[PDB]
Each structure stands twice: as C-alpha cells, then as structure tokens.
Design a protein around this ligand. Sequence first.
Ligand code: WFC
Length: 133
Amino acid sequence: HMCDAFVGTWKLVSSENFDDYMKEVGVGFATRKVAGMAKPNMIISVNGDVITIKSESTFKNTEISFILGQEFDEVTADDRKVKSTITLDGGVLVHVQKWDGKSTTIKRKREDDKLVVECVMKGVTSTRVYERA
Ligand SMILES: O=C(O)[C@H]1C[C@@H]2ON=C(c3ccc(Cl)cc3)[C@@H]2C1
C-alpha cells in the first residue's frame, strides 16, 4: 500500500516556470517549445515492490519502472541518459537524476485532490499540477 494515494491516471492542469527549468537542465530551443506545449497524462501503478510511472503526450511517451532506493538507468523525454534513484521521504516521492556531473531532483506529492510535481535544477524550480483524469 506503498504509494496508494499516487496510483491512478492524472492529467496536467497547470505549469509554472517549466521553460526556465528546462533551460537550466540544458534542453534546446525546439524541444523546450514542443515539450512546453504538452499536456501529459501521468499513469502511476504499483505491482508488488515495482512502481511504474508513464507519461504520455503528443510530445513523447515515457515509462519508468523501479524499486524504491534502487538505481536505474532512464532516458528522459529530452534524451538525456541519466542514472535515477527514487525514494519515499515522508510521503513524497523523491527522484534524483544524475548525468554528466549534473543533478536534478523531481518531487511528486499528493496535496488535496492534486498530484504536485516540483522539478528543481540548481536555483530554478518548476511546479506542475496534475488532477485525476
Ligand atoms: O510533469 C512532469 O511529469 C514532470 C516530471 C517529469 O520528469 N521529467 C520531465 C521532463 C524533462 C524534460 C522535458 Cl523536455 C520534459 C519533461 C517531466 C516533467
């Protein structure tokens, strides 16, 4: 019953500062423009110890499956090849991505009926709010 309140199908309803987050990460112009238009659905499921997070949009479809605390390799929507580790910290899914000596952290939390996603790279934060689909 690990992660029960995250499981389901979620739709993006608002984004703030995502262009600047993508800039900070190193995403190029054309990818930022197309990625920034997307209104993904995020589909979270759990089977035993394995959590799966899918993101589907007109821009890209991504899927990760993982065990908490156990590093895995991820190809991000912008084609970075990163090493990822996801843990639960006080009810928040904390996702760290490492690549080329760089690091970004993505937090996912349940707040009221929303799933709030906070993406941080150095001093730049973006907040993306999802609602149940
Ligand atoms: O809303 C979300 O799912 C957040 C968390 C995800 O993890 N990485 C994202 C990302 C990075 C670069 C690009 Cl170009 C697009 C998307 C997603 C944005």
